[PDB]
């Protein structure tokens, strides 16, 4: 028979050793809080975090998964001999029925640019509905970072047209303005992995989310973000900004998606200006970044960028996730 | 302003040094036929082949391009000082009006699996309508190859689930049958680049197309292809077959897309069986491959595969391009 199933997303998560080991160890570090306790895994996928929770000593784990992949999690649980302690429940966590309130929620809820897919809202729904007073959330907090970037790959792609003459004897340097309009003259957030070679100033933390804190659900609807200021390291074409995040598992173990840190499947969310802007050492850059639900679709990330480069006037660019 | 323009396809072609240099040199090698003559470039894109033709001494080149990219070709022609000899004409070659019949047609018409996009039909339309008797077609011929494959990347992806236990202490080996159904249990042609590490038997030429030959247009409609037979090199999981092509520029310069030869942007067209089949040294494999227009859409490649592995019965699998 023929099927159509998608599977690349799950292989990307398990092949992400930074992601998977950070959760394994973040859960294990909370052994004392989890031993003999009950856990809700929100969006359990193929089930690995629920098993990690049982291996940290959880008495009972409720693995709630809305997509079709829940059946694989049920088989994974059985293969590991845990069917009597880890229960896989299909459907959205907003309507699942558990037999009891839980001592802890674990969830891999982060999307691209942290909030693309808006899954944090389901975790917070579950916290209100099912988490006992003073219960544990894993991870417990998230931080958002921004840095100006000179994207070396983008620089190469754009300049390559002016290199055609040296390789084939045909001048194509006019394709560079065309490529710039196509590659930068759009308002889509681009998900791409960078390295420190791309980072043009010290990264700035622009927001911090404590997931258990009162009022976070309303802050997500109104926009998460803040102002930033930095000074460029040296002369380069500024292509725009990268946004990334970290989350923290309390003891604290930090899972980072910085381009300065080991690569992860989340990569970074890139906010390209309409064209490159030349900067120099100590060029001041300031701005404000706000992460928002899209009006059409609360699960599609919108990012509003306000930015000022050196002496140029402040500009605004309103992005939505690709 | 914001635009939406796609550009990755053109940067892929120019970054393909095998493709671009083979055309540059294939055209230059035909200097004697082209000097002081007229040329039609079918599907001129950003225009580089038309300029190569002028640099080989063509008197006049008609660069016909249907897509929006024709305007960039006009600018490229002007940047190279050739506006008086290379004329860029927008629209389909089937309805363009040239002022004269031409001495030669050059075209980069090959798609994935050679015939995906069915552009060869436009070249042959132009040959009938505009090419002088005894005129030159560049390239002049194409050949199609098939080989059984053991796709090492696919093998890794499928087996990785049984490796999760050794890295995280959670058994996920049941995800392997799920991944196999998702990655192989479909009827899509998959475009992927292989190497000789993937090739499981001597590649077999199964068809040859002389582009100037009578009756080729009807052969494209009825199906291009043929039978093949080979003997496996050694023990491996057979995952199916790769199809690739070469084209020849007469003097002869061969542009090959074999996995044994330098990589190109055409990669190879992979025909996966529904699940891996174990083979051994000297396991005989035979079959038949036919490249067809899809019934819904003549520009989408269909491939009908008949195959017999060792003592197993002959099987059939009907693929269409992803
Ligand atoms: N409201 C909701 N209720 C239950 N599951 C949800 C949900 N929203 C998203 N999901 C699921 O949450 C998962 C997030 S990816 C997390 C994957 C999981 N930790 C694993 O190891 O595979 C996805 O599988 C998605 O289907
Ligand atoms: N019937 C037709 N008439 C004119 N152009 C066509 C065509 N069918 C396809 N094309 C064009 O043929 C091109 C094939 S890709 C060839 C690209 C070109 N040699 C370059 O150097 O860029 C595409 O640009 C496509 O738009």
List the structure tokens of A209: 């989310």
Distances (CA, A) of A320 to A169, A299, B1, B170: 40, 11, 16, 37
- For strand B60-65 and strand B86-90, is the pairing parallel, antiparallel, or unpaired? parallel
A166 touches chain B (CB under 8 A): no
How distant is the Cα of A21 from the closest Cα of chain B, in angstroms? Answer: 8
CA dist A244 and A147 (Å) reads 9
CB contact under 8 A, B181 and A14: no
How far, in Å, CA of A81 to CA of B112, rounded?
Answer: 47
Residues A76-88, buried b or exposed e (16+ Cβ, 10 A)?
A: bbebbebeebbbb
Q: Where are the beta strands (DSSP E) in B150-222?
A: 188-192, 204-210
Identify whether residues B49 and B158 lie together within a single domain. no
Bridge partner list, B301: B293
- The single residue listed with the structure tokens 């579950």 is A126
| Secondary element (H or E) of residue B124 | helix B120-130
Quick count: other Cβ atoms within 10 Å of Cβ A271? 26
> In the Cβ-directed half-sphere of A167, how many Cα atoms lie within 13 Å?
15
β-pair type (A268-279, A131-138): unpaired
Based on the fold, state whether residues B101 and B169 are members of the same structural domain: no
Q: Could B79 and A171 be called an inter-chain contact, meaning their C-beta atoms sit closer than 8 Å?
A: yes
Helix (H, G, I), strand (E, B) or coil at B145: strand
Q: Which residues contact B177 (CB under 8 A, 6 or more apart)?
A: none
Which residue reads 């340097």 in tokens?
A: A173
How far apart, in whole angstroms, are the C-alpha atoms of residue A40 and residue A64?
7
CA of A216 to the centre of ligand 1 (A): 20
Q: Which residues form the domain of A190?
A: 141-322
Tell me which chain B residue has its CA closest to the CA of residue A68.
B178
* Same domain, yes or no: A293 and A159: yes
Instruction: Looking at the structure, tell me whether residues B129 and B163 fall in a common domain.
Output: no
Residue B47 to residue B38: CA distance in whole angstroms: 16
From CA B118, how far away is CA B162, in angstroms rounded?
42
The reply to whether B76 and B106 lie within a common domain is yes
CATH number at residue B306: 2.70.160.11
Last residue of a domain, one of B104, B139, B174: B139
Token pair recorded at residue A148: 């100006």
Query: What are B210's strand-pairing partners?
Result: B141
Backbone phi and psi for residue B293, each to the nearest 5 degrees, phi listed first: -70, 145
Dihedral class, residue A73 (left if φ above 0, else alpha if ψ from -120 to 50, else beta): alpha
For this experimental structure, what is the resolution in angstroms?
Answer: 1.7
Where do runs of H (alpha helix) occur along chain A? 7-14, 17-28, 31-34, 48-55, 70-79, 120-130, 152-168, 175-184, 216-222
Last residue of a domain, one of B94, B111, B139: B139
Q: Which of B194, B186, B183, B188 is nearest to B266 (CA)?
A: B194
Residues 6+ apart with CB under 8 A from B207: B143, B144, B224, B225, B226, B291
Query: How far apart are the C-alpha atoms of B314 and B47, rounded to whole Å?
Result: 47
Residue of A6, A17, A40, A45 best suited for mutating to test ligand 1, as the one with most atoms within 8 Å of CB = A45
Token readout for A61 is: 């784990």
CA quadruple A85, A86, A89, A95: dihedral positive or negative? positive
Q: How many domains does chain A have?
A: 2
What's the rounded Cα separation, in Å, for the pair B228 and B146? 8
In chain B, the residue whose alpha carbon lies closest to the alpha carbon of A49 is B170
B38, B39, B44, B47 alpha-carbon torsion, rounded to 10°: -50
Burial of B114 (0-12, 13-18, 19+ CB in 10 A): buried
Do A28 and A164 fall into the same domain?
no
User: Rounded to an integer, what distance in angstroms lies between the CA atom of residue B222 and that of residue B290?
Assistant: 9
Q: Are residues B152 and B99 in the same domain?
A: no
**Shared-domain flag, residues A164 and A91:** no
B171 & B314 share domain: yes
Task: Give the span between the Cα atoms of B279 and B287, in whole angstroms.
Answer: 16
- Confirm or reject contact between A15 and chain B (CB < 8 A): yes
What residues form DSSP beta bridges with B305? B289, B317
For residues B56 and B189, membership in a common domain is answered with no
Ligand 1: which residue has its CA nearest to atom 3? A92
**Residues B56 and B34: beta-carbon distance below 8 Å:** yes
Give CA–CA dist A248/B81, Å, rounded: 60
Domain co-membership, B292 together with B204: yes
Query: Closest by alpha carbon to B182, among A78, A9, A15, A74?
Result: A9
**Mutation site for A-interface testing, chosen from B46, B158, B175, B320 by largest number of A Cβ within 10 Å:** B175
| Whole-number Cα distances in Å, A300 to A65, A119, A145, B95 | 20, 10, 19, 44
Instruction: Measure in Å the smallest separation between the Cα of B184 and chain A Cα atoms.
Output: 9
Name the β-bridge partners of A224. Answer: A291
Ligand 1 atom at minimal distance to the Cα of residue A69: 24
The C-alpha of A208 sits at a distance from chain B's nearest C-alpha, in angstroms, of: 30
List phi, psi (to 5°) of B116: -65, 125
Segment 176-195 of chain A within 8 Å of chain B by CB: 178-179, 181-183, 185-187
Taken in order B272, B278, B279, B285, the sign of the CA dihedral is negative
Give me Rg for the CA atoms of chain A: 22
Residues A15 and A66 in one domain: yes
CATH number of the domain encompassing residue A31: 3.40.50.150
Q: Which of B45, B63, B16 is CA-nearest to residue B256?
A: B16
- Asked if B75 and B49 count as a contact pair (C-beta separation under 8 A), the reply is no
Q: Which approach determined this entry?
A: X-ray
Among candidate residues B111, B139, B167, the one where a domain is terminated: B139
């Amino acid at each position: 028979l023929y099927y159509e199933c998608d599977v690349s997303v799950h292989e990307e998560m398990i092949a992400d050793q930074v992601r998977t080991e950070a959760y394994r160890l973040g859960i294990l570090k909370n052994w004392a809080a989890l031993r003999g306790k009950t856990v809700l895994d929100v969006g359990a996928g193929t089930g690995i975090l629920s098993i990690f929770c049982a291996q940290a000593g959880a008495r009972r784990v409720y693995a709630v998964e809305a997509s079709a992949i829940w059946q694989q999690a049920r088989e994974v649980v059985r293969l590991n001999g845990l069917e009597d302690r880890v229960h896989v429940l299909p459907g959205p966590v907003e309507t699942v029925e558990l037999p009891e309130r839980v001592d802890a929620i674990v969830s891999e809820w982060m999307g691209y640019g942290l909030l693309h897919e808006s899954m944090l809202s389901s975790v917070l729904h579950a916290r209100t509905k099912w988490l006992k007073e003073g219960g544990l959330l894993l991870p417990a907090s998230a931080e958002l970072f921004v840095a100006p970037i000179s994207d070396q790959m983008l620089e190469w792609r754009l300049g390559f047209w002016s290199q055609v003459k040296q390789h084939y004897g045909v001048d194509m340097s006019c394709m560079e303005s065309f490529a710039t309009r196509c590659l930068m003259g759009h308002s889509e957030i681009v998900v791409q992995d960078l390295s420190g070679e791309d980072v043009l100033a010290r990264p700035q933390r622009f927001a911090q989310l404590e997931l258990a804190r009162a009022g976070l659900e309303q802050e997500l609807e109104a926009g998460v973000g803040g102002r930033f200021r930095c000074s460029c390291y040296g002369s380069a074409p500024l292509h725009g900004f990268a946004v990334w995040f970290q989350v923290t598992f309390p003891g604290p173990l930090v899972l980072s998606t910085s381009p300065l840190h080991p690569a992860t499947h989340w990569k970074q969310a890139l906010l390209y200006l309409n064209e490159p802007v030349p900067v120099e050492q100590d060029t001041d850059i300031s701005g404000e970044i706000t992460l928002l639900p899209s009006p059409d679709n609360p699960r599609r990330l919108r990012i509003l960028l306000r930015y000022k480069v050196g002496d140029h006037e402040e500009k605004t660019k309103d992005f939505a996730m690709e």
